[PDB]
Amino acid sequence: KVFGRCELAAAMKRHGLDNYRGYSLGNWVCAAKFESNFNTQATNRNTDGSTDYGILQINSRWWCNDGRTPGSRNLCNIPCSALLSSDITASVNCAKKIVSDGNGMNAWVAWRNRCKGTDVQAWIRGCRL
Ligand SMILES: [Cl-]
Ligand SMILES: [Cl-]
Ligand SMILES: [Cl-]
Ligand SMILES: [Cl-]
Ligand SMILES: [Cl-]
Ligand SMILES: [Cl-]
Ligand SMILES: [Cl-]
Ligand code: NA
Numbered sequence: 001k002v003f004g005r006c007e008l009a010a011a012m013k014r015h016g017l018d019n020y021r022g023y024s025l026g027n028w029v030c031a032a033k034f035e036s037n038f039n040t041q042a043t044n045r046n047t048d049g050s051t052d053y054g055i056l057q058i059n060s061r062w063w064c065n066d067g068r069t070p071g072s073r074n075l076c077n078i079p080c081s082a083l084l085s086s087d088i089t090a091s092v093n094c095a096k097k098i099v100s101d102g103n104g105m106n107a108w109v110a111w112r113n114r115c116k117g118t119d120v121q122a123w124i125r126g127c128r129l
Contacts, residue, residue, distance in 0.1 A: 001086035003038040003055070005029065006127035013129055015092040021099045026120030027111065032056055033123070034110040041084050054083030054091045056108065063094055
C-alpha cells in the first residue's frame, strides 16, 4: 500500500508512535518518507546480504526473520514479510523496539541524514489528527 502523508500520520498516531521515546509524529512521517516513500512494499538489499523491509525499512540482521540473513536475530519475533502489510501494526510495534535500543532514531541512517534537526512538524501540517 502507498499511504498518503496525512493518512500515514494518522495511522502512526492510532498505533501510539506520536511522541514515542520523545519523537514527535513529524519525525516518524519524515523517516517513512525517505525510507520507503510511504510504500509498505518497499525492500532494499544491503551489501552484507541483509534486507530492509516496509515503510520504515526495518533490517533482517536484528529485527525480523527472512531465512536468508546468516547469523541474524529476530528481536521483533516476526517474519520480515509482516513488515510489507497494508496494516502497519507490525512495522510500528517493531519500530518501538528499535527506537528503544539506545541510539533513538539514529538507528535509521536516513532519519539522521535527512530529518534530524529539520522542521519536521511540516510533515504533519494540514493533517486532521
Ligand atoms: Cl509527501
Ligand atoms: Cl512533529
Ligand atoms: Cl536468517
Ligand atoms: Cl532472536
Ligand atoms: Cl518467521
Ligand atoms: Cl494501518
Ligand atoms: Cl533519544
Ligand atoms: Na533475522
